[PDB]
From a paper:
Phosphopeptide antigens are naturally processed and presented on human tumour cells by class I and class II MHC molecules. We defined a canonical motif, involving a phosphorylation at position 4 and a positively charged side chain at position 1 (R/K), accounting for ˜ 50% of the HLA-A2 phosphopeptide repertoire. For phosphopeptides with this canonical motif (hereafter referred to as canonical phosphopeptides), the phosphate moiety could act as a “phosphate surface anchor”, mediating extensive contacts to HLA-A2. To address this, we determined HLA-A2 complex structures of three canonical phosphopeptide antigens (RQApSlSISV, termed PKD2 and derived from Protein Kinase D2; RQApSIELPSMAV, termed RQA_V and derived from Lymphocyte Specific Protein 1 (LSP-1); RQIpSQDVKL, termed RQI and derived from adenosine monophosphate deaminase 2 (AMPD2)) in both phosphorylated and non-phosphorylated states.
A third canonical phosphopeptide (RQI) was solved in phosphorylated (RQIp) and non-phosphorylated (RQInp) forms in complex with HLA-A2, to 1.7Å (HLA-A2-RQIp) and 2.1Å (HLA-A2-RQInp) respectively. RQIp exhibits a 75-fold enhanced binding to HLA-A2 relative to RQInp (Kd 25.5 nM versus 1925 nM, respectively). As with previous structures there was little difference observed in overall MHC structure (rmsd 0.62Å) for both complexes. However, unlike PKD2 and RQA_V epitopes, RQIp and RQInp peptides showed no conformational rearrangement (rmsd 0.39Å), although RQIp exhibited phosphate-mediated contacts (left) similar to those of other canonical phosphopeptides. As a result, the molecular surfaces of RQIp (left) and RQInp (right) accessible for recognition are very similar. Secondly, in HLA-A2-RQIp, as for PKD2p (right) the phosphate-mediated contacts elevate the main chain conformation around positions 4–5. The proportion of canonical phosphopeptides in this category is unclear, but this group includes both RQIpS, and the RVApS phosphopeptide derived from Insulin Receptor Substrate 2.
Residue numbers in the entry:
A (entry chain A): 1 to 274
B (entry chain B): 1 to 99
C (entry chain C): 1 to 9
The structure:
């Protein structure tokens, strides 16, 4: 199937409580592989998956150099945005950035991303064509005009279509045993009643990878959304994921309902009944 | 933009009394990132709790996994206690081994 | 692998 590489960056200013704190994390699909914490012991980019340890000192030096430079730029950006939005130096603020690339089943380029947020809302984003920008508000047009002049998109395009794709491929090959695995979900259904009148059926999906999954309820072979509850896919803590979907049914009608599970690790979709 | 955390409390593996496991509290969908998260045993704060590195979703909202190793019993009651700027008082979610 | 340039708002 398809794959992605993504980096996620967060900086928070806290006036009167020191200089900003910066956190960087890198993922391939749903697996974290690197981290940097500006207040942590090492002051280096750190490994978080076994296969990235295959990379040598030039890599760890280079990635450390780049992430530290990124942290300093966010410190500059926090000041820049305070100015753009005419804000005082008393409040706490947050800058976020994400970038990365998607490839299809043939490992060829599908899509690239490069975008920023300020205080929980969009600020600026690279469009799908990798040639133009979407500015979220009037303030962000200043950044847009600046980046168009300095040809930022062209440089970013080269990374997203080349370097990003090639290194995603390298990681997938180097960590084949884990990154290219598909762990099908362990599935079961439970039944619970507090009254004589209704019962909750809960369809479970456990120990699956990647996180991508679809859980649907049907009644008499028709999709059923009313009286259902679906929880957010959640991490087990061991590199696998969990999810449940539940439906409240009238007593005596449990057998009308089926739970349908779709996952890459399943050769065909699964059907569960009470 | 501020967003209130979603909270899920659950075990890593299917719970079996007397067998070691990990207790998880997954907080997600929040903004800003400043958050307080305690795991509780019979109403008391568990000392040794670890957490994931701050990350975020496509809507920019943050998520963290807090976790501790524990051995569940019939007697003991577990919970997650969360405070955030969006909450007037700490929010307590009890661990239900079936959720 | 990270992008190899300095992007500033």
């Amino acid at each position: 199937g398809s794959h992605s590489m993504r980096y996620f960056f967060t900086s928070v200013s806290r006036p009167g409580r020191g200089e900003p704190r910066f956190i960087a994390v890198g993922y391939v699909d749903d697996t974290q592989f690197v981290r940097f914490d500006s207040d942590a012991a090492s002051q280096r980019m750190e490994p978080r998956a076994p296969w990235i340890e295959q990379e040598g000192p030039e890599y760890w030096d280079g990635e450390t150099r780049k992430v530290k430079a990124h942290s300093q730029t966010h410190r500059v950006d926090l000041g820049t945005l305070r100015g753009y939005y005419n804000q005082s130096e008393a409040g706490s603020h947050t800058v976020q950035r994400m970038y990365g690339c998607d490839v299809g089943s043939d490992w060829r380029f599908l899509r690239g991303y490069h975008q920023y947020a300020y205080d929980g809302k969009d600020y600026i984003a690279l469009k799908e064509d990798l040639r133009s920008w979407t500015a979220a508000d009037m303030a962000a047009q200043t950044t847009k005009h600046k980046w168009e002049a300095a040809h930022v998109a062209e440089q970013l395009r080269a990374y997203l279509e080349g370097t990003c794709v090639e290194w995603l491929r390298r990681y997938l090959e180097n960590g084949k045993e884990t990154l290219q695995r598909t762990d099908a979900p362990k599935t079961h259904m439970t039944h619970h009643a507090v009254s004589d009148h209704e019962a909750t059926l809960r369809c479970w999906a456990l120990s699956f990878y990647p996180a991508e999954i679809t859980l649907t309820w049907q009644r008499d072979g028709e999709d059923q959304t009313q009286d259902t509850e679906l929880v957010e896919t959640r991490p087990a803590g061991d590199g696998t994921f969990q999810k449940w979907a539940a439906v409240v049914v009238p007593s005596g009608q449990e057998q009308r309902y089926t739970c349908h599970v779709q996952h890459e690790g399943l050769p065909k979709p699964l059907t569960l009944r009470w | 933009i501020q967003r209130t955390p979603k909270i899920q409390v659950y075990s890593r593996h299917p719970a079996e009394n007397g067998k070691s496991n990990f207790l998880n509290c997954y907080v997600s969908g929040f903004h800003p990132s400043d958050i307080e998260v305690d795991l509780l045993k019979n109403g008391e704060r568990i000392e040794k709790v670890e957490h994931s590195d701050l990350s975020f979703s496509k809507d920019w909202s943050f998520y963290l996994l807090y976790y501790t190793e524990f051995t569940p019993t019939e007697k003991d009651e577990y919970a997650c206690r969360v405070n955030h700027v969006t909450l007037s008082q700490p929010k307590i979610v009890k661990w239900d081994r079936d959720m | 692998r990270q992008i190899s340039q300095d992007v500033k708002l």
